[PDB]
Amino acid sequence: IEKLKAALPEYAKDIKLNLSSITRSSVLDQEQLWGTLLASAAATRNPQVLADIGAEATDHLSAAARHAALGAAAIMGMNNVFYRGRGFLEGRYDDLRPGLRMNIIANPGIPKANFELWSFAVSAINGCSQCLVAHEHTLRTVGVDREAIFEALKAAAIVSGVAQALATI
Amino acid sequence: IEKLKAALPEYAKDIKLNLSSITRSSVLDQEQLWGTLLASAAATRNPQVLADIGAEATDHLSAAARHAALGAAAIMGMNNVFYRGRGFLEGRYDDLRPGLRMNIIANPGIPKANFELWSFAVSAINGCSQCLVAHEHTLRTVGVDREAIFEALKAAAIVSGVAQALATIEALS
Amino acid sequence: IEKLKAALPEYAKDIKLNLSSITRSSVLDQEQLWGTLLASAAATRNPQVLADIGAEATDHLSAAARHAALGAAAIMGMNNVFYRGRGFLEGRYDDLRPGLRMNIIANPGIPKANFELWSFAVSAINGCSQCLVAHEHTLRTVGVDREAIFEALKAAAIVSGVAQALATIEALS
């Protein structure tokens, strides 16, 4: 949403400059861009941005896609915490069974190439490496350029910057 | 708790099933099962979520209990930053008095245990290993199990997933 | 300050003494302690805290300064995520070219040795080791004392504790 680029303060010019440029590249198609932009935004917790990018991510994302990217955010929210947490315990709990349900990572709808990538984005924002890494893997395998994956990280990072600046005014 | 479940969308079923399972569970002291779901929901920072795990906790915890829980998140919000922080600085700050009071550490009511428990929980939501390890090494001393610390982590992670799941819908309309 | 200290609960007793203690600081400046305080509040994302600190802020800080601390939080918000993610990938992308504009960092408007203190404090709140370490290195290079940097870290953690503490009350009841 352009009203979103317009809401950014003047001491956060860079973020604006980075938002209009990331939100209109090409390296990623539309479903991969807006899909990541949507996932990242719900992950910032700033509803302003989620409402805006989402409104824009309707003329690009499919009905299933929207739910997908939002599901990714939902489920990485739990996992990013779990795995990073276990990871900090020197493997001392790797034996138990997490029990956490997550049939959705099997994507329950939409291509994994995209699901997986949006999960990357979210993991980048939440700060969980044991997840950021495996998704870069699951991706790299199914394909996806090293360029596309990087741009997504750039997307997560820029969405996070917008959230912060809009949350300072 | 049961109310909050009809909230999540069709795209977050896992979270739902996940939420009814962690509480339906019985791996730890019912108390340990709420000041952890509480301190944790408080850690998430979602107002809606903190309210529900606020309702079913109304004496589901021992009054001074909530104080300990909610006090765990509050004091950890400080600690998880300072310590994670000092831990990134190559140890060039390991000898400076972090004149930060945290006396609540000598927990109020609740015996100095479940504190380190939901404390541990909170540390997970915030991502501070430095703390997460100490509260675990200590928890594994006051005779606290391990399936229970694990159970706590599952709890911490699930509420966050519930937080994220909710906050997205709570905004869009 | 005072108005914010009284809004906090009883159990958050330790944070109180902390914000109160961090407030009447000598270690850092008026501009320093306050851009940090201001940038940290913005970083905790808590509306109320940004407001109380801002209100008091625009009193010890110049417009160019208040804007700088807010720009730091905004820009670190982008950078703390990118750099952290790239480090998680183990340099396997360390030179793919970020292509992310900054410069607010090159020239923030006010003296760097203050903008850096502010970016540092925010990187501690977001938890980016790559950034904290860079900004901490930079700081020493330009003359700031580790006591001062240590003071900024504390500020950030204490402010964080405030946000967390005030957040729960604001939610429940």
Nearest to B72 by CA among C170, C55, C164, A55: C164
After which residue numbers is chain C interrupted with C–N beyond 2.5 angstroms?
none
Nearest to C14 by CA among B108, A121, A76: B108
Distance CA B56, CA C78 (A): 38
Which tokens go with B10?
């069709």
Which tokens go with B40?
């944790």
Q: SS3 for B164?
A: helix
Q: How many CB atoms lie within 10 A of CB A166?
A: 20
Please name the residues in contact with A92: beta carbons below 8 A apart, sequence gap of 6 or more. Answer: none
Q: Backbone phi, then psi, for C22, in 5-degree steps? A: -65, -35
Long-range pairs, A139-142, Cβ under 8 A, ≥24: A139/A113, A142/A112, A142/A113, A142/A116
- Residues of chain B with Cβ-Cβ distance to C156 below 8 Å are 81-82, 85
Distance CA A115, CA A106 (A): 9
Distance CA C123, CA C156 (A): 9
Q: What subunits touch chain C, counting only 3 or more CB pairs under 8 A?
A: A, B
At B127, which amino acid appears?
Answer: G
Distance CA C138, CA C157 (A): 21
Burial class (CB in 10 A: 0-12, 13-18, 19+), B171: middle
Distance CA C39, CA A12 (A): 13
CA angle A123/A129/A133 to nearest 5° reads 85
**Cα Rg of chain A, angstroms:** 16
Burial class (CB in 10 A: 0-12, 13-18, 19+), B30: exposed
Task: Yes or no: say if C131 and C76 are a contact pair by the CB < 8 Å rule.
Answer: yes
DSSP state at residue A8 = S
Q: Which residues 58-87 on chain C approach chain B with CB closer than 8 angstroms?
A: none
Task: Yes or no: say if C80 and C128 are a contact pair by the CB < 8 Å rule.
Answer: yes
At C45, which amino acid appears?
Answer: R
Distance CA B21, CA C10 (A): 33
**Which residue in the set C67, C81, C86 is minimally distant from A160, CB to CB?**
C81
Residue C93 CA from chain centroid, whole number: 28
Complete domains list, chain A, with CATH: 1-169 (1.20.1290.10)
**Which residue in the set A13, A147, A168 is minimally distant from C70, CB to CB?**
A168
Distance CA B148, CA B73 (A): 19
Q: Which helix (H) or strand (E) holds A151?
A: helix A146-166
Q: Which helix (H) or strand (E) holds C155?
A: helix C146-171
Residue A144 CA from chain centroid, whole number: 16
Distance CA A88, CA B128 (A): 9
Helices (H), chain B: 2-5, 13-24, 35-44, 47-55, 64-86, 114-126, 129-139, 147-172
Which tokens go with B35?
């000041």
Distance CA B164, CA B170 (A): 10
Task: Yes or no: say if B83 and B130 are a contact pair by the CB < 8 Å rule.
Answer: yes
- Measured between alpha carbons, how far apart are the two ends of chain C, in Å? 22
Q: What is the DSSP secondary-structure string of A67-124? A: HHHHHHHHHHHHHHHHHHHHHTTTTTTSSS------GGGG-SSS-HHHHHHHHHHHHH
Compute the half-sphere exposure of residue A33: CA atoms within 13 Å on the CB side of its CA. 18
At B37, which amino acid appears?
Answer: L
DSSP state at residue B110 = S
Distance CA B143, CA B138 (A): 9
Please name the residues in contact with B13: beta carbons below 8 A apart, sequence gap of 6 or more. Answer: A103, A104
Task: Yes or no: say if C15 and C162 are a contact pair by the CB < 8 Å rule.
Answer: yes
Distance CA A4, CA A37 (A): 13
- Measured between alpha carbons, how far apart are the two ends of chain B, in Å? 22
Nearest to B54 by CA among C8, C15, C7, C169: C169
Q: What is the DSSP secondary-structure string of A31-82? A: HHHHHHHHHHHHHH--HHHHHHHHHHTTSSS-HHHHHHHHHHHHHHHHHHHH
Q: Which helix (H) or strand (E) holds C169?
A: helix C146-171
Yes or no, beta carbons of C154 and B99 under 8 Å apart? yes
CA angle C66/C132/B163 to nearest 5° reads 80
The single residue listed with the structure tokens 């998880």 is B80
C111 touches A: beta carbon within 8 Å: no
CA dihedral A91, A97, A101, A102 (to 10 degrees): 40
Q: Backbone phi, then psi, for A46, in 5-degree steps? A: -80, 110
Which tokens go with A23?
């939100």
Please name the residues in contact with C155: beta carbons below 8 A apart, sequence gap of 6 or more. Answer: C22, C28, C33, C36, C37, C40, C121
Q: How many CB atoms lie within 10 A of CB B9?
A: 16
Task: Yes or no: say if A60 and A102 are a contact pair by the CB < 8 Å rule.
Answer: no
Please name the residues in contact with B133: beta carbons below 8 A apart, sequence gap of 6 or more. Answer: A88, A89, A90
A5, A153, A158, A166: which to substitute to probe chain C, counting the most C Cβ within 10 Å?
A153
Compute the half-sphere exposure of residue A72: CA atoms within 13 Å on the CB side of its CA. 36
Distance CA B154, CA A102 (A): 13
Q: How many CB atoms lie within 10 A of CB B133?
A: 16
- Residues of chain C with Cβ-Cβ distance to A9 below 8 Å are 67, 70, 74
- Residues of chain B with Cβ-Cβ distance to A38 below 8 Å are none
Which tokens go with A139?
């991706």
Q: What is the DSSP secondary-structure string of C43-85? A: HHT-HHHHHHHHHHHTTTS-HHHHHHHHHHHHHHHHHHHHHHH
Task: Yes or no: say if A11 and C68 are a contact pair by the CB < 8 Å rule.
Answer: yes
Residue of C nearest to B74 (CA): C165
Distance CA A113, CA A46 (A): 26
Rounded alpha-carbon distances, angstroms, from residue C40 to A26, C108, C157, C162? 35, 17, 8, 10
Query: Max Cα separation, chain A?
Result: 52
Q: What is the DSSP secondary-structure string of C87-135? A: HHTTTTTTTS-------TTT--SS-HHHHHHHHHHHHHHHT-HHHHHHH
Which tokens go with C8?
């906090």
Q: Is the dihedral of CA A31, A36, A23, A150 positive or negative?
A: negative
- Residues of chain C with Cβ-Cβ distance to B50 below 8 Å are 168, 171-172
Rounded alpha-carbon distances, angstroms, from residue C168 to B43, B51, C70? 9, 9, 24
Yes or no, beta carbons of A160 and C104 under 8 Å apart? no
Please name the residues in contact with B2: beta carbons below 8 A apart, sequence gap of 6 or more. Answer: B20
Nearest to B129 by CA among C129, A136, A73, A134: C129
**Which residue in the set B45, B75, B80 is minimally distant from C14, CB to CB?**
B75
Nearest to C32 by CA among C131, C145, C157: C145
Distance CA B78, CA A93 (A): 26
Helices (H), C11-46: 13-23, 31-44
Distance CA C120, CA C141 (A): 14
A126 touches C: beta carbon within 8 Å: no
Length of chain C: 173
Which tokens go with A6?
């317009």
Which tokens go with C79?
């950078």
Q: Which helix (H) or strand (E) holds C2?
A: helix C2-5
- Residues of chain C with Cβ-Cβ distance to A127 below 8 Å are 81, 84, 127
User: Catalytic annotation on B131?
Assistant: yes
Which tokens go with A21?
């440029």
Distance CA B34, CA B19 (A): 13
